[PDB]
Amino acid sequence: SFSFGGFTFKRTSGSSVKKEEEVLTGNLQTLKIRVHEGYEEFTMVGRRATAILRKATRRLIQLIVSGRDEQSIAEAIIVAMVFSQEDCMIKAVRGDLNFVNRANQRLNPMHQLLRHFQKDAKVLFQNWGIEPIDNVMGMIGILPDMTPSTEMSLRGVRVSKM
Numbered sequence: 001s002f003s004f005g006g007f008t009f010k011r012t013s014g015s016s017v018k019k020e021e022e023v024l025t026g027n028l029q030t031l032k033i034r035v036h037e038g039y040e041e042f043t044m045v046g047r048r049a050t051a052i053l054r055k056a057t058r059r060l061i062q063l064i065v066s067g068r069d070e071q072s073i074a075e076a077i078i079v080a081m082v083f084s085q086e087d088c089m090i091k092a093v094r095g096d097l098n099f100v101n102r103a104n105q106r107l108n109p110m111h112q113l114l115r116h117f118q119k120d121a122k123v124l125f126q127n128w129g130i131e132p133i134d135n136v137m138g139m140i141g142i143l144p145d146m147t148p149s150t151e152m153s154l155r156g157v158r159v160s161k162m
């Protein structure tokens with residue numbers, strides 16, 4: 001297992017290899033990130049939310065999340081979206097990320113991205129994409145404004161009851 005964003009990730013299937021890669025933000029800033037290449041499935045376990053995640057290289061395929069309340073579920077979703085390394089997440093950074101402030105000198109770009117969206121996730125959520133759902137019993141869709149829906153949801157994301 002390993003820890004990212006306050007969650008313990010445990011791989012349940014698949015595998016990956018690591019390599020450094022450049023990516024471009026919405027403000028055309030170049031970031032170097034360690035990309036994981038491979039299809040993998042994980043459990044994500046936090047103190048206030050849990051999830052099942054399926055991902056491929058820089059793609060979130062499925063996230064089923066449950067938790068105490070909207071704030072904890074939203075935080076899990078943010079951590080999963082950043083962890084996915086998806087282009088739409090990188091492109092949702094619309095101004096420059098600061099690496100020079102003394103308090104940011106030991107954050108790698110993945111952790112700079114995470115902090116950015118923890119401060120404010122509106123642009124992330126509005127640019128991720130939505131899809132119609134054929135709602136499954138015991139689950140529900142979640143919209144970009146973090147309200148529930150039986151008709152639409154953030155792409156790949158569903159909320160479960162505890």
Ligand SMILES: CN1CN([C@@H]2O[C@H](COP(=O)(O)OP(=O)(O)OP(=O)(O)O)[C@@H](O)[C@H]2O)c2nc(N)[nH]c(=O)c21
Nearest residue numbers: 002003004011016033034036040083084085108110111
């Ligand atoms: C996206 N990540 C990140 N990650 C793991 O999550 C932790 C934090 O990721 P990170 O801070 O970018 O990577 P890390 O290699 O530790 O830092 P650095 O790039 O600065 O050397 C590490 O344990 C890393 O191996 C992952 N592990 C697996 N299996 N699959 C993945 O897609 C990813």
Ligand SMILES: [Cl-]
Nearest residue numbers: 046047048049
């Ligand atoms: Cl807690």
Ligand SMILES: [Cl-]
Nearest residue numbers: 055056059061
């Ligand atoms: Cl796929």
Ligand SMILES: [Cl-]
Nearest residue numbers: 006071072075
């Ligand atoms: Cl939190």
